[PDB]
Structures are given as C-alpha cells and as structure tokens.
Symmetry: D3
C-alpha cells in the first residue's frame, strides 16, 4: 500500500526532526 | 540525549523495514 | 562537525516530509 | 525496478538498525 | 563505535543513491 | 509526483553522504 508507505515516511520525517533537534543540542552543548 | 537519538534511530529502522515490506508487496504484484 | 550533522539531519527531515506528501498524493489517486 | 527499490530499502532498514544499536551502546556507556 | 556509524551512513547514502536512480527511471518511464 | 520523489531521494542521498563524512571525521579523532 502506497498509503502505508506515505504514512511511514511521515513518521520517518518526524523521527529525523527529533534526531536533528537532539544533535543540535549536543553540538550547542 | 544520546538515548533519545538511539531510540529515534530504532524507530526509523522499524519504519524502513515496513517500507521495504510494502514496496516488495507492490513489486510482487 | 556536530553542528553540521545537526543541520544535515534537519534538511533530511524536511526532505522526507516532502517525500511523504508526494507519496500521499499518489496514494489518494 | 520496484524489486530493486524494495531490496534497497531492506538494506537501509538493516543499516539503521545497526546505527540504532551503536548509538544505544554509546549512550549506555 | 562512531567508526561503525560512519560506515553505516556511507552504505545508507549508497542505497538512497540507487533508490533515487530507480525512481528516476520509473518517473521517466 | 514520481519525478519530485526521485529528486528528493537524490538530495537525501547526498546529505547522508555528507553526514557519513562528518561522522568519519569525528570517528578518527
């Protein structure tokens, strides 16, 4: 299902947004 | 938090496993 | 290095967000 | 080839599983 | 090991390069 | 849509290539 693929990429985008935030904090640190 | 990063990559791995499974099913058909 | 990694993950997150939207568009065809 | 895409996403999932495992080990320490 | 993480991201980059190529061919098609 | 997806995956591949290089730099510290 492409509908499932779309939803899974949406979740991946959310997780990478969080990863970017955490590395941003580590770097600033 | 590195623990947060690790958890988020674990989630990403699980989503890509699902994406691979869906594309495989699409390709099968 | 970590600052650059944080920015690269931020850009990756935005790109996966766009990919998810494109697949969503194809899914609800 | 969709079969190639599916195979490549399967490989990606396996690499991110490994990345999650490594970051978890780093965070543990 | 960050050395392992670096190698795993290098592999991921290679796989996404192939995915991009295959979708480019499907789209052109 | 597929054309845009192909281009987004191409950009993602390049970004993961850069991330891999940055982690490689941190790894051989």
């Amino acid at each position: 299902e492409l509908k499932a693929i779309a939803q899974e990429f949406k979740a991946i985008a959310k997780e990478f947004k969080a990863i970017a935030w955490e590395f941003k904090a580590i770097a600033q640190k």
